[PDB]
Design a protein around this ligand. Structure first.
Ligand code: NA
Ligand code: NA
Ligand code: NA
Ligand code: NA
Ligand code: NA
Ligand code: NA
Ligand code: NA
Ligand code: NA
Ligand code: NA
Lengths: 545, 545, 62
C-alpha cells in the first residue's frame, strides 16, 4: 500500500458515480516524451540580477517587441543565462525566423508551437483571461505567447492548405465578473467589452492567415456565476462574498484530441518569460487522457453555446472569410492513437475536474475530494508546491481549503502529520506582490496546531507541536536561499514519490472551474523531483519562528 | 506662511457650504490636559520578548480573566515594563479593585473609565463591531475594554443615583455586512444575530447595575449599504465590489457633550493591551469640538431610529428595569463649558467627517477633501503614519485613495514631492497579518513615480526618481529596527509640524463613514512628535529601493 | 448622440475601426459650424431651409 491512482478512481466512483467521465476518468496509459516537464523559472542558484541580465541587449542590438527578448548574432552578444537561438516559433507568416537571446523557460513556447503546427483536426485552448491591471482588456494571451500562437496558426494554415477537412480551433477564457471598471449591475456593457477584445484577437489572427485557408477559429469567454449575494452552486460550509462568483480557471492546450499541455501556466508572457519570472509548471503528455481534456472543453463550450438563460456569455467565429456565430460546442472525444504514439515513458494517468458553481450540478467538485483522499492515504511523504494555502475573504476572514465528504486538505495533512508522514511545503513568498502567499508560514503551522487540538485528536498544544516540528516543513520559494520576494504559481503535490497532480486547482479556495491530471509512476515522479522539486527545495527559505 | 486650519475650513465652506456643521466645523478653541495623547504600543527601542514579559505571571499569581494581566502584590512580581497597580477601572460593582501588572498602554482604559464615571448627562460611544474571527459575534468591545466599560457604568450608576434626571448612554457599532456565516441574501437572519448579541451585551451591563438607577442605556448597530452590486452613494471614479458596502468606522467616546476620546482605537483588548500590541493613537480633548462629535453621533442615530428606507438596522434600550425601543436619536449639541474647562493647553481644532455612502447625500465626504488640501498646501513637511495606503479589491485590483474635486491623496503627495516638501511615511509591516500594510514600499514609490509621469508633470521616469529619492522616505513600523512583523493601525498625519489629524479615516480607500479632528498648534504637535512620531520613526525600518 | 448614450437598449449598436483596431469610440458629434470651401459659390444660388422629424423616442414628442 503506497497509494495507487486506481484507489482514487474507485473512491470517486463509489461516491460520485454519476460524474464518471464528467469530472474524472478511469486511469489510462499515456506517454511522456523527453521535455515533457514544462517547468519555467529563474535559474535556481543564481541571482535575480544575473538572470535578468538575460534580457539586456548588447552590441548594436535591440529588444524585439513581439517576443521581448534581445536580438542576436551569436552567443557572445547574449547576457545572463541566455544563448543565441533561432526558434521556429519566431517564424512569421512569410517564413523568416529571428535570432534571439533565449532562456530555458522558453521551452514552453517550443512545446506550444510544435504541438499546434502539427494539428490535423483540432486545436483546443482553455485558459484564464489576462488580468486587467491597467492596460487594454486583453484576451487569451499576452506578450510572447500571443506572437507564438499567431505564428503557430500561420504555419498551421500552410501545413493544412490542401486538407480534405477544416481544422477546428477553439480559444476559450474564463473572465472575471464583475469586470474591471464595471459594477455587477452592468452585465450588458461587460458583454460588449468582452466581444470587442475577442473580435480584435480573432481579427489579428485572421490578418496573418492566407486569404483562403481551412481553419475555423472561434474565440469565446465563459463565466458561470456573478451572484455575489448567494451561493454559486457548491456544498461549502464556508460563506464569503469572494466565493460567490465563478469562471473557468482550467488551462489546456489540446491538439487533435491526442496531445495535451496542461498545468498552472496562464499564457501571460511578462509573468513567466521576462525579468523576474514566476515559477510555474505544466506538462506535455500524449494519449487517451486527451479525451478527458476534450470533454472538459466540451462541457464549457456546451455551456457557452446553449446555456439559456441566467448569465450570458459571448463568442465569435472566423471561417471561410466570414465572421459567424457557428458555435463549436463539441469536438469528438473518441481517442484515436496516432502513429508512433507509444513512444516515450508509459504512465498511468487519470483526470479530475471541478465543474460545479453554475456549469454542472453543485455536487460536481471531484478535484477537491481526489486530493483530500490522496493526502489522507499517503504512507511516506507529501510534497506540496503552491502559490498559497489560504485565501483572504472579502472582509478579512481567512478562507481555508474547501470541505469535502472526506473533510478538508488541512484535516488530511493533520492526519498525515499525526501518523508520522513527512509533509514538505513550498509556498510563494509573502512579499510576492500579485503572486503572494497571502499568509506567512507561522500561520499555517498554527492552523494545523488548531486542527490537532480539536477533531478526533484532542491534542494538547505543546504535544501537538512535537508532531509538527518532526514532520512538517514549510518553506517559501527563493532563487538562491537569500532573496525574499520571489514568486511561485505552482499547483503541485506529490504523494509517496509516486503520485502527483498537475493542473489548475490551487489548494487555496475559490469557486472557479478546474482541470487537472494525476500521474502514478515512480520513474516520472523521480524525473520531476530531479528537475524541479529538489533544486527548488534546496534553494527555498525556511522561517523558523 | 505655513498651513493654517482656517484655510482648510475656508476651502470646505466655499465648496461644500451646505455641509457646514454637518461634516465639518469652524475651528474652535479646545483644551488638552496632561495625558491627552493616548498612544498605545509596545515600548519602542526594546524587543517584543522583553515587552511581552509584561504579561507573565509568577506561579503563585495568575492571569486575571477580566483584564488579561497578571495578578500582583508588589512591583517585584511584575515583569517586562509593567508595575503593580490597583486601577479604578478594575473596581467592580461591590467597590473592590484588583492589583494587576499594568503597562503604559492601559492609559487608554484610565481615560475611558475616568471620563465615563464623571458623566452628568450623557455617555455617547461610537465604534466598529469586533471582527468575527471565531464565529463569536461579540458586540462593541472585547477583552479588558468590556470589563472597563461595565465597571465604569456600575460606578456611574452610583455617582448619579440621586440625579434629578436620567443619563442617556448610547453604544453604537458599525457592523460588517454580509456578516460572517451569512450570504448577503440573508438580511433577516443577520439582523436577528445582531439583536441577539446586543441583547446579551446589554443584559450583561444590566446585571452589574443597581435594580433602580437613572441610566437609560441603548445598544445599536448601523449599516448604510449592503448592495455589493452597485454604488453606495459617492463620487468615486473607481469601482469595486468591496467599495459597495458601508457601515460606520468612526470611533468616539463623548461624555456630556464636552469630553471626547477619538482616534483609531477600536475597543478591542487583545489587539492593544496584551502581547504583541498593535500601535495606535487616540486623543482625549475637552471643549466645543465635542459638539461636532455629538452631531456625528446624532446623524447616525437618527439614521438608525428613522429607518429611512431599505436597509434595516437594530437597537434596544434598557431603562427603569425594562427593555424598550425608546430610540435615543438626539443628544443636544449646544456646548456648555464646564467649570475649570480652560485648564490645559489651548488649541485650535476643527472636525471633519465622511457621512455619505447611504447616510447623507453622496457629496458628504469632506474628510478626504480636507486631507488632500492639507497635503497640497504643505510648505515644509508631511509626516504620515498609517496601517496602509492602498487596498486590494475583490479580484486583486489595487484601489488607491479616493478622488476628490481637488484630486487624490497620491496626486497631492506627488505635488508636495515635486515642490521639495519632505514626505515621511510609516506604514504597518507587510508581515502584519490582520494589520498588514498590504503593499510593499516599492509599490508606493512606483505608484508615485507613475503619477509624476502623467500630466501636469510629464517627468521622464529616471529623472522623476530623483525627486522621490530626495524627498520621499517610506518606512514601516518596528519596535526596535529589527523585528519585521510588527503592526500599526494609525490614521495619523502631520503637516509642517503644526497641523495634525486624529480620527478614524485611513488613507487607503473604503466606503465607511468616518469622524476625525484637525488640530492646529505648534506646541501640541511638538508634544505629539516627542511622544510618538520621533520614537516610532527612529525605530522604523527602511527598505531601500 | 442617441446611439452613443443609449447603446444596448432596444436595437442600438455600433462599432468603430481605426488605427487597425476595433473600438467603441462613438462619433456622437461632428462639428456643425459651416466653413465655405474655396469656389463654393459656383452654381445657382438658392434659398434653402431644413425640416426634420426627430419624434418618437429620440427627442421630445413635440
Ligand atoms: Na517562468
Ligand atoms: Na522563477
Ligand atoms: Na533576451
Ligand atoms: Na477551448
Ligand atoms: Na497541445
Ligand atoms: Na480548496
Ligand atoms: Na488586557
Ligand atoms: Na494591558
Ligand atoms: Na504606522
Amino acid at each position: 500500500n503506497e497509494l495507487d491512482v486506481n484507489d482514487i478512481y474507485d473512491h470517486l466512483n463509489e461516491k460520485y458515480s454519476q460524474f464518471n467521465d464528467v469530472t474524472f476518468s478511469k486511469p489510462s496509459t499515456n506517454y511522456l516524451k523527453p521535455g515533457w516537464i514544462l517547468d519555467t523559472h529563474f535559474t535556481f542558484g543564481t541571482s535575480s540580477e544575473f538572470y535578468n541580465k538575460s534580457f539586456d541587449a548588447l552590441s548594436f542590438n535591440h529588444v524585439d517587441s513581439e517576443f521581448n527578448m534581445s536580438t542576436c548574432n551569436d552567443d557572445s552578444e547574449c547576457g545572463g543565462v541566455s544563448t543565441c537561438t533561432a526558434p521556429a516559433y519566431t517564424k512569421n507568416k512569410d517564413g523568416d525566423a529571428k535570432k534571439l537571446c533565449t532562456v530555458p523557460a522558453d521551452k514552453i513556447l517550443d512545446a506550444i508551437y510544435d504541438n499546434i503546427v502539427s494539428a490535423k483536426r483540432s486545436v483546443d485552448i482553455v485558459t484564464l483571461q489576462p488580468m486587467d491591471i491597467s492596460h487594454l482588456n486583453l484576451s487569451f494571451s499576452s506578450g510572447a505567447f500571443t506572437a507564438t500562437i499567431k505564428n503557430a496558426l500561420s504555419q498551421l494554415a500552410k501545413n493544412t492548405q490542401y486538407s480534405d477537412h477544416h481544422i477546428t480551433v477553439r480559444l476559450l477564457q474564463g473572465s472575471f465578473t464583475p469586470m474591471l471598471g464595471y459594477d455587477a449591475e452592468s452585465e450588458e456593457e461587460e458583454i460588449r467589452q468582452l466581444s470587442l477584445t475577442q473580435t480584435n484577437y480573432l481579427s489579428e489572427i485572421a490578418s496573418v492567415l492566407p486569404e483562403v485557408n481551412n481553419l475555423d477559429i472561434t474565440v469565446g469567454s465563459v463565466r458561470s456565476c456573478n451572484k455575489l449575494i448567494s451561493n454559486c452552486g457548491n456544498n461549502n460550509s464556508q460563506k464569503d462574498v469572494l466565493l460567490n462568483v465563478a469562471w473557468n480557471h482550467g488551462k489546456i492546450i489540446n491538439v487533435d484530441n491526442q496531445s495535451v499541455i496542461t498545468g498552472g501556466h496562464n499564457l501571460w508572457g511578462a509573468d513567466y518569460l521576462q525579468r523576474n519570472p514566476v515559477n510555474d509548471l505544466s506538462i506535455n503528455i500524449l494519449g487517451p487522457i486527451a479525451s478527458t481534456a476534450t470533454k472538459y472543453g466540451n462541457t464549457l463550450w456546451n455551456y457557452v453555446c446553449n446555456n439559456t438563460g441566467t448569465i450570458t456569455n459571448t463568442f465569435v467565429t472566423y471561417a471561410n472569410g466570414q465572421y459567424t456565430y457557428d458555435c463549436p460546442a463539441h469536438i469528438s472525444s473518441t481517442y484515436v492513437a496516432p502513429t508512433d504514439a507509444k513512444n516515450g515513458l508509459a504512465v498511468k494517468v487519470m483526470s479530475i475536474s471541478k465543474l460545479n458553481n453554475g456549469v454542472l450540478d453543485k455536487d460536481a467538485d471531484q478535484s477537491e475530494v481526489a486530493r483530500v483522499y490522496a493526502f489522507k492515504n499517503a504512507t511516506k511523504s507529501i510534497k506540496i508546491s503552491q502559490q498559497a494555502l489560504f485565501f483572504k475573504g472579502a472582509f478579512g476572514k481567512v478562507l481555508h481549503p474547501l470541505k469535502t465528504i472526506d473533510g478538508t486538505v488541512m484535516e488530511a495533512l493533520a492526519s498525515a502529520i499525526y501518523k508520522g508522514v513527512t509533509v514538505d511545503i513550498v509556498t510563494s513568498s509573502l512579499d510576492g506582490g500579485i503572486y503572494s502567499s497571502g499568509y506567512n508560514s507561522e500561520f499555517v503551522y498554527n492552523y494545523l496546531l488548531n486542527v490537532l487540538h480539536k477533531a478526533p485528536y484532542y491534542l494538547e498544544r505543546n504535544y501537538a507541536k512535537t508532531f509538527l516540528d518532526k514532520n512538517l516543513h514549510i518553506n517559501f520559494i527563493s532563487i538562491n536561499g537569500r532573496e525574499t520576494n520571489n514568486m511561485s504559481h505552482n499547483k503541485l503535490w506529490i504523494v509517496d514519490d509516486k503520485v502527483f497532480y498537475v493542473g489548475s486547482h490551487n489548494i487555496y479556495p475559490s469557486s472557479l472551474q478546474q482541470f487537472g491530471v494525476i500521474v502514478d509512476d515512480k520513474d516520472a515522479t523521480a524525473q520531476l523531483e530531479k528537475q524541479l522539486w529538489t533544486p527548488m527545495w534546496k534553494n527555498s527559505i525556511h522561517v523558523p519562528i
